[PDB]
């Protein structure tokens, strides 16, 4: 239902085939403005930016002030931070699992593909390994 409805409000947008996943992608953004009051996903970048500019004017320095904090946080943030999110999806077994396990599986899996970024302890170098893992031709993992 959600999958249908999401695309039902985007169908008048720009539809194309992802040359990465090979999937059917639909892009409503900067699309034709609605003719009625049926849910519209066709947001206009210009208007989203203009809105944010006014917000930035009304609250001066807040964006960089936050960005600073959010950035300085990430640098301190360890990997174990991920082990506090109930049932996370584990790609190694294609089932949900405890956050702490779902991570462990990924760290153990990554090591086999020569990805030890986790071991450094900070979240950033572990994150680097995730966006790197996409460029691996094959991905190898333990399964009992």
């Amino acid at each position: 239902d959600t999958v249908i409805r999401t695309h039902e409000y985007s169908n008048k947008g720009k539809q194309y085939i992802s040359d990465v996943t090979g999937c059917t992608m639909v892009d409503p953004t900067n699309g034709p403005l609605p003719e009625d009051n049926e849910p519209s996903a066709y947001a206009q970048l210009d208007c989203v930016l203009e809105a944010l500019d006014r917000m930035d004017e009304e609250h001066p320095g807040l964006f960089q002030a936050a960005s600073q904090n959010a950035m300085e946080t990430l640098m301190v943030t360890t990997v174990d931070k991920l082990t506090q999110g109930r049932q996370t999806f584990d790609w190694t077994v294609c089932r949900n699992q405890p956050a702490a396990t779902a991570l462990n599986t990924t760290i153990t899996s990554f090591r086999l593909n020569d990805l030890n970024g986790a071991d450094k302890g900070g979240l950033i170098p572990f994150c680097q390994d995730i966006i790197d893992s996409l460029d691996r031709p094959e991905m190898t993992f333990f399964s009992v």
Binding site: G13, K14, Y16, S18, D19, V20, M25, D27, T29, N30, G31, L45, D46, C47, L49, E50, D53, M75, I124, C127, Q128, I131, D132, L134, D135
Partner: protein, 231 residues
Amino acid sequence: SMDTFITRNFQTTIIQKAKNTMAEFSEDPELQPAMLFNICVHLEVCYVISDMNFLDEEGKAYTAQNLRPQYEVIEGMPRTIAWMVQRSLAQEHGIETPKYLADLFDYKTKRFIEVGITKGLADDYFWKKKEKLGNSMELMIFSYNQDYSLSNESSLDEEGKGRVLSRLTELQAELSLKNLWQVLIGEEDVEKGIDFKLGQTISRLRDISVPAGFSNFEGMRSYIDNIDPKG
């Protein structure tokens, strides 16, 4: 560069255990080899002071079955191990822990030992480090121009004191023989930028993850950065 040099001079023990010390301080071993060599020498000097120094069950120093040395090598051991060792020693023998991390500790003396290698004068560098410690650790300073400045109570014997000054000049000569002595002389400064580079895949995903009327992400970035959408 220093890359090929340290492989010949120092063993993998000293190479790696230093690169761990550098890693914990979060500075690249290759982008600052001057800093690597300093800690390598700093570590190699410390091991020589506690190499053959052994204690018997009676409680007297002797030269080398038996597994209990006279000194305790703190330099090399990771921070949280080093500090555990340092605290464990202080609390056991019953003295206050120094606020700074020590290099060595003599089990017979029951005192902490701070080691320091300098380029100019060893006598000057003794009074420089006396400001921080004062009398928390019994300093033991050395330099490459055959100049030693130990504490009033120095346990280091005549046969021991030589090996240090020998290896100090032996390496200092080997750096001059390879024309790499000049590499350590010149100043080296670099702030370690927190670089997070994107791969090929994720970069492509980003380019297809853009609003309509954009060739690639670079476009969306520069559009957002530059143009003002008032009205």
